[PDB]
């Protein structure tokens, strides 16, 4: 359908680091994260005591949350760069993007899968903020379905968090994110 | 050195209009200001009670304020359009942009003059955020100076407000602004 971009949700101009959340979704790490302008850079060897908790996700800040109906039809964009020893054969075990949202009695988590970026390649992802390619978190492996338009829109009615994968490949040494924006009409 | 843009400060997702103020900020209004995609449109007939205060200025929102050293060397851009009885009016000599900033007890006001826009035309402005073409507010017409590097940077250290003129011509009917951005490193 038509989407006329009005503006974008972004990090604040002065916001130069983001926290990492662990794979258990229960611990936040800031140590080891350095702004190396223009990128936010996580150095695995500078967060050794938390490495046992990987994989990690970047947690977007709170301006991306709440009522985001106006984002329906637009793109979530960001740029990833990572260095690792080799690729994993299975970059879908951990979704690329995780969003929780929704109104009372309807809240739920949905996930978006993407092929991992190539090692060493600054990679600009564009994730359409509509239902088509999204999956429900926690579906049994025998259940093969996609997210409904109504559920996607209920989630956008009240976003609770947006997480972007930070861990890629085997023996990842560093990972970077920049150029984060979400279009709104 | 050269200024190297990283991103822009733009309107936020929740900001679809901006208020008008008089040049001294004695009065503020949003009556008669409407978002008419893609522009912010001020209809003077809907604030007839306030017109005695012209010229009016758009007041940029809070994310353009505060510590804006990062903007030094960048460009402030926007697009304007107006309708009026006459293309040129009494306020053509009032500044296009006004910035106040600095420490609370050493605040200073600077101004930027621009060519007059043609009536009924979309006119784009670019204002470099360096001192060369800026003047001190209220300077005596008997003297001819421009703003020093120190004074300009003192203001960017802590911007209090940025005003962009909204009144053009004589008996202005409507004015519009769009495409608002400020480059930051």
UniProtKB/Swiss-Prot annotation, chains A, B:
Subunit structure: Laminin is a complex glycoprotein, consisting of three different polypeptide chains (alpha, beta, gamma), which are bound to each other by disulfide bonds into a cross-shaped molecule comprising one long and three short arms with globules at each end. Alpha-2 is a subunit of laminin-2 (laminin-211 or merosin), laminin-4 (laminin-221 or S-merosin) and laminin-12 (laminin-213). Interacts with FBLN1, FBLN2 and NID2.
Domain statement: The alpha-helical domains I and II are thought to interact with other laminin chains to form a coiled coil structure. Domains VI, IV and G are globular.
Origin: domain of life: Eukaryota
Compartment(s) where it occurs, according to its Swiss-Prot or TrEMBL record: Secreted, Extracellular space, Extracellular matrix, Basement membrane
Illness association: Merosin-deficient congenital muscular dystrophy 1A: Characterized by difficulty walking, hypotonia, proximal weakness, hyporeflexia, and white matter hypodensity on MRI.
The protein's name in its UniProt record: Laminin subunit alpha-2
Functional summary from the UniProt entry: Binding to cells via a high affinity receptor, laminin is thought to mediate the attachment, migration and organization of cells into tissues during embryonic development by interacting with other extracellular matrix components.
Tissue: Placenta, striated muscle, peripheral nerve, cardiac muscle, pancreas, lung, spleen, kidney, adrenal gland, skin, testis, meninges, choroid plexus, and some other regions of the brain; not in liver, thymus and bone.
Residues in Laminin IV type A domain copies: 4-185
């Amino acid at each position: 359908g038509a989407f006329l971009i009005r503006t974008w949700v972004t990090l604040k101009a002065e916001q130069t680091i983001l926290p990492l959340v662990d794979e258990a979704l229960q611990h936040t790490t800031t140590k080891g994260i350095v702004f190396q302008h223009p990128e936010i850079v996580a150095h695995m060897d500078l967060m050794r005591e938390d490495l046992h908790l990987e994989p990690f996700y970047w947690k977007l800040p709170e301006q991306f949350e709440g009522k985001k109906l106006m984002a329906y039809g637009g793109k979530l964009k960001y740029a990833i760069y990572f260095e690792a020893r080799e690729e994993t054969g299975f970059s879908t075990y951990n979704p690329q993007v995780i969003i929780r949202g929704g109104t009372p009695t309807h809240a739920r988590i949905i996930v978006r899968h993407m092929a991992a970026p190539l090692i060493g390649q600054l990679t600009r992802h564009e994730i359409e903020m509509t239902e088509k390619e999204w999956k429900y978190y926690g579906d049994d492996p025998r259940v093969h379905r996609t997210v409904t338009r109504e559920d996607f829109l209920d989630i956008l009615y009240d976003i609770h968090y947006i997480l972007i994968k930070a861990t890629y490949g085997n023996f990842m040494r560093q990972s970077r994110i920049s150029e984060i924006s979400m279009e709104v009409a």
